[PDB]
Amino acid sequence: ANSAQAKKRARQNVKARKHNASLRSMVRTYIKRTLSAIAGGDYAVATEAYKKAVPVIDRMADKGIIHKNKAARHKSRLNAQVKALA
Amino acid sequence: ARYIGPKCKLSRREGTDLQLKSGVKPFDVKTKKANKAPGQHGQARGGKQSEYSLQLREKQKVRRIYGVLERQFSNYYKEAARVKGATGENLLKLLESRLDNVVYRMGFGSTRAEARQLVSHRSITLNGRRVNIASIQVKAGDVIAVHEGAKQQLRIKNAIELAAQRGIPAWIEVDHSKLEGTFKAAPDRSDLPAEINESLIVELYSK
Amino acid sequence: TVRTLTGKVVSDKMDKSIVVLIERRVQHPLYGKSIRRSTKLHAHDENNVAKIGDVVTIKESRPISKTKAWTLVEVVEAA
Amino acid sequence: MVVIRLARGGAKKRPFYQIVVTDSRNARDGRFIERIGFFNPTAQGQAEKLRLDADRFAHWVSQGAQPSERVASLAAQAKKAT
RNA sequence: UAACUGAAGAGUUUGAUCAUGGCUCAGAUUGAACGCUGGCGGCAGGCUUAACACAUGCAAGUCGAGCGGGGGAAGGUAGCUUGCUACCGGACCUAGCGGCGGACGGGUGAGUAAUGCUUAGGAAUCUGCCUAUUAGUGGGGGACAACAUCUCGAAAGGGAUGCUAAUACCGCAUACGUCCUACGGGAGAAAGCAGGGGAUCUUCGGACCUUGCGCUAAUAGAUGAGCCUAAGUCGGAUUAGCUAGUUGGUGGGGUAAAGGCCUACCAAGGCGACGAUCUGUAGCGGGUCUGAGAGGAUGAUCCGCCACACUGGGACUGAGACACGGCCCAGACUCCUACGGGAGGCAGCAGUGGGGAAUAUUGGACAAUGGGGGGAACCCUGAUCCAGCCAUGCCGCGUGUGUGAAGAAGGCCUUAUGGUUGUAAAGCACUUUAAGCGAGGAGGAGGCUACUCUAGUUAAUACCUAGGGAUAGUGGACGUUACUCGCAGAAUAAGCACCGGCUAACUCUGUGCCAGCAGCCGCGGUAAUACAGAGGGUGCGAGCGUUAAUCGGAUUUACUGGGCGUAAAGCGUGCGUAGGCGGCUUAUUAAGUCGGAUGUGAAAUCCCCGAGCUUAACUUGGGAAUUGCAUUCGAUACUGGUGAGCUAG
């Protein structure tokens, strides 16, 4: 970078990248836990995992880490897959 | 540019008086070489000429009368061809509408060259402004006058005296006491002299 | 208020899809003689109603696959 | 945002402005949405000095366009004249 | 009213001739270059070649009214070596955190024959700042730069420990809208700052009221962008077969969003002589040049779209980038080094080297129009507006005007004394354009500040917002502006090509197939109108010629608009595939064909009528035009489709 503001932008970019990566990985982990419960197949366990996962997805979507359309897609598809377990 | 040089040899080559001199003395007595070309190989007017030669020699005569060079003359022809009506009539009206020609036909200039000199030196006002362009087109109803500083000039009195001898034109209404005239309308082809065959210039440029 | 086309089915092998051949008659831009031009369109047939040789009507729709953006409306004439 | 501003035309030292509605990110003399009048600061004789279409001006202002300071002054002048 | 109206030929094959057929010439045009010459102004244009390599300066910042620190100037009080010292309250500045901007504006055409462009439509999307409307802005917590200490390095810059503020970050609470839903329910936000003030309290310094700028959730609008479809968009067959995520389907993934976009299975599909695949070339359009038109050539300057940023591969942040002056990786190259370690990308503006036949200043100002930040004051802006250079082009002007013959001199020619130069010159009399000197002087500046009043919102006369009035200040790079008025003096200002025919303009000397000229036919071998000089003339004129290039003439690829017995040209002859075309009558259809209506066909450009430039170039108002495309409604003679019938093929 040639200018001071460009250097500052690069520094802020690095810091925001680390923070966003943390939150995104949290979302992925919760979705993966829900998927693991679904694969296990117990209805109550899958329901508990889904109920745990939904608030995290919603909070990160509100913060802007993911899009709210993405959050809605995840909620709908995971709810359908849980309901399939009867 | 502008042609500067001998005037009478141009008339001799063209074969007709071109009004380049004021007119105190007749052209024949002035030149004594009329009826002959200006070259050492010059002949009489009876020599054979091609159609290209006739067309060229016709346009050169008009150009030498009006003091207009080739590029401006071509622009005049293009404007005349664009404007509806007889092309030769439009071209002649365009030539006569020039400010320097109008001053000469008013009589403040004994020659078109003198009128052009006056216009350039800002001795003439159009409407109420001191213009200095000889090629300004004069429109119907325009008023031409002499500037006060230029008034009381022996050349102007001589020019108006000579204009008194010359035929006063119909389309221009001029009072000599205060030295001011009005352009009423564009002259007609019938009003203009009939020795000019503008059709030759038309066929020259139409090729 | 939808764009429709009428043509002849030239293929029905794939699942839920037909190949319709459209024909148009146009003037040659320079020589002025009317000539024949043909275009091949992939359509969607949910129940595989159409067959080879039928005359069908198709209408423009949102994309359904890589090459399909038209859907069958009705079978005007059956082979 | 959408703005109403002057686009410079004419010749050297004799500017002639078109009043245009455009996205503010476009070039001054480039892409525009709608032309709604003109301004000629050095008009004389029979030349019209200012012309503004008040109906379209009000329509775009209600839609959310932001006039520049000069265009706002010209609109005030046109309203006073009419 | 008007928006166009438009078409020329010539030379050259032969002892003549007619035809055929090439070659050449007369025109228009240019981002031109070169040769000779060169006064001024206005308006434009200015690396077409090396997307070659780049020294140096500038081209992106702004906000203290988001935040904590840290600075250095003026004041005041107290002491006194007496004009010096110690502290204290205000006014300024900014390295750091944070917000917005940096995705615009600017450059270039390398790549790209279709993921691009043009025209016409469409559904499955997101969209900061702007406009309207609705519901809100409650209460806590843990950190990290700055700072302090240590340490490496000449530095530039690095590394390590201990603190701290916020509109930085994360929980909890609440939810008109919003998301999911199995229709039972479940889930998710935010931040403060500033101006003013009556009364009250002030746990002691603010609370409280009010008004702005903000922040959160959402729905519309506007703007911008993403996606899809149809038709059109340069050659090559001495490139004929191409394709296995390939074509389609299902489950799942993924995206803002449809979709083989991805993945696992199932099927064997998909494209191609209406040119697939491969290969050469190329940014596309509005437009520009030429042409009677149809066509042909072209894509500088202006506008729209696309693509690229030393060469390749990626992602981050963000509303928006896979980002010219941001990051990571790889490659080549270049630079500093104290050998420890570092730095870079002009196809931004100016400029340098090189290349080339050839293309300019390392300039001024943010005054105007715009763009970024800010509440404002104001700051930034090589965008822009101007200036400098160049006859590169277009338009305009000047280089003087009248008179002046028993026709001066000199030059050239001569049938030898006349002719031509020529009214040309001298002489006489006038003039002051432009350039020079001096004096005045618009407009491009709308506004802003101060003063006054009115009307809104409020508890308010304060603050803020919106208006009106008069006065005074303040604001121009260009710039000594345009323009106007005076001064002296013809005084400062003319060249270039050609004269055998095509093609306007002719002789004399010099030379003798030499020297030389030449677009074509052709000139020169002792009287050369064709070579060189001179005299004279012709054409243009601050220009004149040459070279290069496009269209034309060329009916010389012939659609408009040509030919094939002998001039070039009928396959050696049949059969036959695709294709092209096809007898008569009738009913029907409305694809071709024709007509109407509606939408669209950006602006600029061309054309017409006006307007302003002293005129013109040029600028500009309004029209006309954009011959096209799409939708829809009609007609049924002809062609096509379908049904029936017939016999001359």
Swiss-Prot record, chain A:
Any one Gene Ontology cellular component term annotated for this protein: cytosol
Entry keyword annotation includes Ligase: no
Region (Disordered): 1-20
InterPro entries: Ribosomal_bS20, Ribosomal_bS20_sf
Keyword Lyase: no
Molecular-function annotations in GO: small ribosomal subunit rRNA binding; structural constituent of ribosome
Bias-annotated ranges (Basic residues): 6-20
Pfam families linked: Ribosomal_S20p
GO biological-process terms attached to the record: translation
Keywords per UniProt: Ribonucleoprotein, Ribosomal protein, RNA-binding, rRNA-binding
Protein family per UniProt: Belongs to the bacterial ribosomal protein bS20 family.
Function: Binds directly to 16S ribosomal RNA.
Protein name: Small ribosomal subunit protein bS20
Source organism of this protein record: Acinetobacter baumannii (strain AB0057)
Swiss-Prot record, chain B:
InterPro entries to which the protein is assigned, alphabetical: Ribosomal_uS4, Ribosomal_uS4_bac-type, Ribosomal_uS4_CS, Ribosomal_uS4_N, S4_RNA-bd, S4_RNA-bd_sf
Gene Ontology biological-process annotations: ribosomal small subunit biogenesis; translation
Keywords from the named record: Ribonucleoprotein, Ribosomal protein, RNA-binding, rRNA-binding
Origin: domain of life: Bacteria
SUPFAM superfamilies: Alpha-L RNA-binding motif
GO molecular function (one): structural constituent of ribosome
A GO cellular-component term linked to this record: small ribosomal subunit
Name used for this protein in its record: Small ribosomal subunit protein uS4
UniProtKB/Swiss-Prot annotation, chain C:
CC terms in the record's Gene Ontology section: cytosolic small ribosomal subunit
Domain of life: Bacteria
Keywords: Ribonucleoprotein, Ribosomal protein, RNA-binding, rRNA-binding
GO molecular function terms listed in the Swiss-Prot or TrEMBL record: rRNA binding; structural constituent of ribosome
Keyword Transmembrane: no
GO terms (BP aspect): translation
SUPFAM superfamilies noted in UniProt: Nucleic acid-binding proteins
Job description of the protein: One of the primary rRNA binding proteins, it binds specifically to the 5'-end of 16S ribosomal RNA.
Subunit annotation: Part of the 30S ribosomal subunit.
NCBIfam families, per database record: PRK05610.1, uS17_bact
Similarity annotation: Belongs to the universal ribosomal protein uS17 family.
Protein name, entry field: Small ribosomal subunit protein uS17
